Each structure stands twice: as structure tokens, then as C-alpha cells.
Amino acid sequence: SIIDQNVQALFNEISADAVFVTYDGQNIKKYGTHLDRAKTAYIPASTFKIANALIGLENHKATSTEIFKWDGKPRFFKAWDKDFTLGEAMQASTVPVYQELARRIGPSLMQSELQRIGYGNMQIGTEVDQFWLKGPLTITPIQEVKFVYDLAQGQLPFKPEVQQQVKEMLYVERRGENRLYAKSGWGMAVDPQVGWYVGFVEKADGQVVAFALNMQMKAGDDIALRKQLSLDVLDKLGVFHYL
């Protein structure tokens, strides 16, 4: 089809190894310049915030209303030097807030929860607030896509209201009836560095298309390339048309 050519020609300009996986609940589809990335495991980086919020809410370690207060120590971004709810920190990808959450869960409960839900290789190592940024936790694009697909559907092994709350923490924008939810990632501490843009498009019809961009990153890259490439792809596929 011509839509496949349109999508592949998008990647034919990107000077970085990339894969974009889709999942409509039945078919996995892969596009990009290196399809084998879809089956390769990378650290989740900030996409792990999804599982971290789910585990923390499920296990009475935080609420979606609770305020995670700034402790006064300057964070990496001046924008992070304030108080956040888990929702607000999800949109800002505020790493220190989610590290505080991981420490509340603790390594024993984090480990057993990741085994219970089967998230990636389920390895956390010995630093409970570092494993998704430096390893040893890894996950494939195919695994990320089926994970967030189930989140959209309320079919993860979590309480239904916990999934609903984390689902709307991911809410980016709606276009007419169709809703985009997404979370970006950039694992800089590993080699190669890995970039993520994972999420799903919910139609008012109820159909869901989950997606995961996974691409190699270099220091200095355009931080906005992950989201703009994913939205380009979704429009060319006719999943999430530009308005």
C-alpha cells in the first residue's frame, strides 16, 4: 500500500536507527529503518513511570491527589523545583518525584510486583531508584506496546480505578473524538542511548491502537523529534490524523 511507503519514507530521512511498532489488539505491525529493534530489549527509561505509578497506587504508597513536595535541592531542570502530583510529574517526566515513589515501594515489593505482572526482564538490581535509568531492567518495544495496550483497556493486573488514574496521567490531547495518550523516554546513562515514545490512540468507537517508537539517540539530538516523528507516523497511518 501507499501508506506503508509514506510511513517508511518518513524514516528514510532520519539519521538514526529507529523502529515504530503498532498494536491494535490483534496484529503487531513494525515500521522504520531497523525492524529488529522491535524485539531487542532496552532499558525503559522514563517510560517505566507508567508501571511505577501503577505499582505505587495499587500498593497504597501514594494517591493521585497526594502532593510530592520539593525538598529544596535544585533539580536538573529549574522547572522541577516545585511540588508535583504523580499526574503532574508524569507530564513533566519529573525523575526525582518517581524516585521518591520507588523508594516508598522498596526493592522487595518492586521486585515481586514486576514479576507478578511480567514487565520486561523484571530485573531491578540493587538500586531501587535507578534500575529503569541504568539497567538492569529492559523491555522490548513489542512488550511496551502490549503493556500500554492493556492499560488502555483496563486489562492489566491492577485495580480498575488504578489503571484509570494512571491512564489519564498519560493524556496528551484529543482530536475530535480520538484521544492520544503518550509517554516519552530517553535513557542517556546506557550505551547506546535509547529514545522512546510510547502510548496509544483511543477512538470514541472504543478501538485502541497502541504504539512504541524506539530509536537510537545521541547527545545533543532534538528533544522534540520523538513526539513529532510519532505523530507524523500516526497521521500517515490514518490512526491520528493531523487536524
Ligand SMILES: *C(=O)[C@H]([C@@H](C)O)[C@@]1(C)CC(S[C@@H]2CN[C@H](C(=O)N(C)C)C2)=C(C(=O)O)N1
Ligand atoms: C527519562 O527517560 C529521561 C532521563 C531520566 O534519562 C528524562 C526524564 C530526561 C529527558 S530529556 C528532557 C526532559 N524533558 C524534555 C522534553 O522532552 N521536553 C519537550 C521539554 C527533555 C526525557 C525525555 O524523554 O525527554 N526524559
